[PDB]
Amino acid sequence: ELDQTAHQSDRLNNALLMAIRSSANVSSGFIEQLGGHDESAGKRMALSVELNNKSQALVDEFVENAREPALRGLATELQATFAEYAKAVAGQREATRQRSLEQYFKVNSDAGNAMGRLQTLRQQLVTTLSERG
Amino acid sequence: QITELDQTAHQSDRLNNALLMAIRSSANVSSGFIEQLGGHDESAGKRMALSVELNNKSQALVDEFVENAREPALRGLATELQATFAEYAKAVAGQREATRQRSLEQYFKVNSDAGNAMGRLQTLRQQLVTTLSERGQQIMLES
Numbered sequence: 001e002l003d004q005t006a007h008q009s010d011r012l013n014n015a016l017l018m019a020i021r022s023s024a025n026v027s028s029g030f031i032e033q034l035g036g037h038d039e040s041a042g043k044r045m046a047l048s049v050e051l052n053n054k055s056q057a058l059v060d061e062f063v064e065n066a067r068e069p070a071l072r073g074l075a076t077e078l079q080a081t082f083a084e085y086a087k088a089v090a091g092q093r094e095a096t097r098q099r100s101l102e103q104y105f106k107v108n109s110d111a112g113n114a115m116g117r118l119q120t121l122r123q124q125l126v127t128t129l130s131e132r133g
Numbered sequence: 134q135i136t137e138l139d140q141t142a143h144q145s146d147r148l149n150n151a152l153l154m155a156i157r158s159s160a161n162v163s164s165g166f167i168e169q170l171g172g173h174d175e176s177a178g179k180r181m182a183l184s185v186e187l188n189n190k191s192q193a194l195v196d197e198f199v200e201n202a203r204e205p206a207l208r209g210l211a212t213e214l215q216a217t218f219a220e221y222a223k224a225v226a227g228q229r230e231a232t233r234q235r236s237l238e239q240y241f242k243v244n245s246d247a248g249n250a251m252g253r254l255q256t257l258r259q260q261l262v263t264t265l266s267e268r269g270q271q272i273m274l275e276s
């Protein structure tokens with residue numbers, strides 16, 4: 001079950017890295033569109049979508065495998081904060097498709113706040129996994 | 134052996150936090166540039182401050198990581214990570230300068246320096262995580 005700890009750590013760390021890369025790509029893509037780099041922006045938008053799908057799958061696996069009573073509530077809190085973040089990054093993508101600076105501003109506050117919480121929740125989970133091992 | 138095992142985990146954790154804050158740092162510049170272009174200068178300035186904060190915390194973790202990377206199986210990767218992070222931090226600083234100056238043209242080149250260096254940072258993290266985990270397991274197989 002120590003092998004399970006390593007699999008859980010890989011899922012959590014990769015999910016969060018891919019999730020922030022998804023958002024970074026959509027913001028970069030938006031700036032590319034502003035500069036007229038429209039073929040390059042589309043690559044960024046495709047990578048944002050793909051990174052969202054991959055990171056969501058890893059979060060889902062993480063919560064499927066976080067059965068221990070010490071982790072159950074914290075893993076669901078991670079599931080919920082991650083869903084909040086993913087819905088903000090989907091908002092960033094829609095604002096980019098609409099080329100709307102104001103729509104981007106509205107949703108970006110939600111994205112930054114949910115990512116700040118993901119960083120602190122990750123540390124809580126790392127600590128619980130660490131005592132679990 | 135529990136000491137060297139707790140050290141191996143701390144190192145992996147420094148690396149993970151450092152890379153997450155580093156990517157966040159660049160994302161905040163990009164999204165701060167979009168906020169500034171939409172007239173939200175106060176939010177954009179907070180994002181520039183957060184970009185600086187995050188990359189300075191990352192830098193401190195990378196430096197501490199290298200200081201604690203003694204084994205030859207690890208210090209070569211670690212000094213590459215530190216050298217690559219230096220390039221990355223400079224490119225993100227260039228992104229912030231381009232934002233404060235409101236220049237798309239300056240932005241685009243450095244976002245590219247930044248993304249290149251970040252691609253390399255990501256691979257080095259993977260290699261270092263695997264190397265740390267191999268050392269932890271080697272200790273275990275000793276026990």
Ligand SMILES: [Cl-]
Nearest residue numbers: 112115116157
């Ligand atoms: Cl953030």
